[model samples]
Target chain A: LNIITVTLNMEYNFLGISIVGQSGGIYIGSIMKGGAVAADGRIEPGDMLLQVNDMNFENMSNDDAVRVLRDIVHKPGPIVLTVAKCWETSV
Target chain B: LNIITVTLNMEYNFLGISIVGQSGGIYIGSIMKGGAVAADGRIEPGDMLLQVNDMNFENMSNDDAVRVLRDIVHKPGPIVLTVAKCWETSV
Candidate 1:
C-alpha cells in the first residue's frame, strides 16, 4: 500500500520524476527537487509505478508506460499513481 | 452520484461510443451495440463523462474531452470512465 497519489498541473508535464520501463513494471529512476512527485516526500528511485488510477502497468512495454504518463499529463484532474516502494527503504 | 464505469481495450480505441463535448462536460453522443461501452448496460446517449478514473473533466474543452478518451484507449489496462446519467431516466 505504498501508493502515492500526486496532483499535477499540465504545466509541469514532467511531474519532476523520471521513469524507466523495468522487467516487472515502470521504475522510478529519479525524482526532481521541488517537483510535483518530489514534493510528495515518499517516492524513491527504486519505487515502481504500478497503476495510474485503475490502469495497471502489469506486463506493459517501456514505450507504452511512458506514453501512459504523457497522456495523463494532458488531462485535467489529479493524477493518482499507485507506487510500490522499495522494501528496504520502507518506514 | 450517477456514475458508470466502462472497461475498454486499446484495440477498441473507439470503445463503440461516440462522444461530443458539452457545455458542462463531455456528452455521450451514442453507444454502439456489441461495442465495449454498449455492453456496459448502464450508459445512455445523453450521459456525461465526468471523470476518467480520478481525473475530472469539469471545465475541459471539447477537444480535451475527446483527447482524454483517445489517450485511455492506447494504454493497457481497464479504462474506468465515470459518467453522469441524464436525470429524466434512472433505474
Candidate 2:
C-alpha cells in the first residue's frame, strides 16, 4: 500500500539532533481518514517528530522527509520524534 | 500513522480519462508553512493534478499527479477539482 506524505517543518538544536519548532513541526496528518492506526496517539497539534523508523532527518527536504516517513517508518505503533517545547512565543 | 504529501503541477487533454491543458505535465509545490491551499482553487498557483487513487494519470507529471483526494475519499469531505481556470500560466 502506498502512503501520502508531507513535511510540515524541521529545526535543530546547537548540536544536531533534530528538534521540533516552537509551533510548526514535521508530522503526519492522516488525510486518508481510515487506513491504519485509528488514533495517532500523543502526536498533538504541536509535537515534533525526530526520526521515522530510524531514518535520519539531516538536510532532507519537506517532500523527501515525508516520503521516508510514509514509505519506510509507517508501521503500527509507538514511533518516536525528537522534540522540545517552549512557553516563549514568536512573532 | 504517517502522512505528508505535496505536489504543484500537471495538465490534461481534450477527451479520454483526461480533460484540459495543452502544456507540460507533472504536479508539485507546497512550502513548510501550513494551509497553502492556493487562491484560485482550480489551483491558484499552477494547479497541477490529474489521477488520484487509481494511478494511471495517462502519464501525468507534477509530483506524480499529487496522489489526489486527501489520501481518502470523503474524509476531508468531497475533494473534487477540475478546471483550467484562465491566464493559463506555464512552467
Given candidate 1, what's the lDDT at residue B68? 72
Model 2 accuracy (lDDT, Cα): 0.31
lDDT tens readout by residue for model 2, B1-91: 1112233222211111211122123222221222223422324322233344345354654333433333333233223333222122000
Task: Note each model's CA RMSD in angstroms.
Answer: 19.0, 17.5
Candidate 1: residue B24 lDDT (0-100):
44
lDDT of each: 0.61, 0.31
Best by DockQ: 2
Cα deviation in Å at residue B59, candidate 1? 2.5
| Per-residue accuracy of model 1 over B57-88 as CA lDDT, tens digit each | 87776667667767766667677777776532
- Weakest ten-residue segment in model 2 chain B by summed lDDT: B12-21
- Candidate 1 chain B has its poorest 10 consecutive residues by lDDT at B82-91
**Each prediction's TM-score versus the true structure:** 0.43, 0.27
lDDT of 1 by residue, A1-91 (tens): 5555544443445577766431235656567788677776766655667777666787777667677767776677677777775432000
Off by over 4 Å in 1: A1-91, B9-11, B89-91
TM-score of 1: 0.43
lDDT: worst 10-residue window of model 1 chain A: A82-91
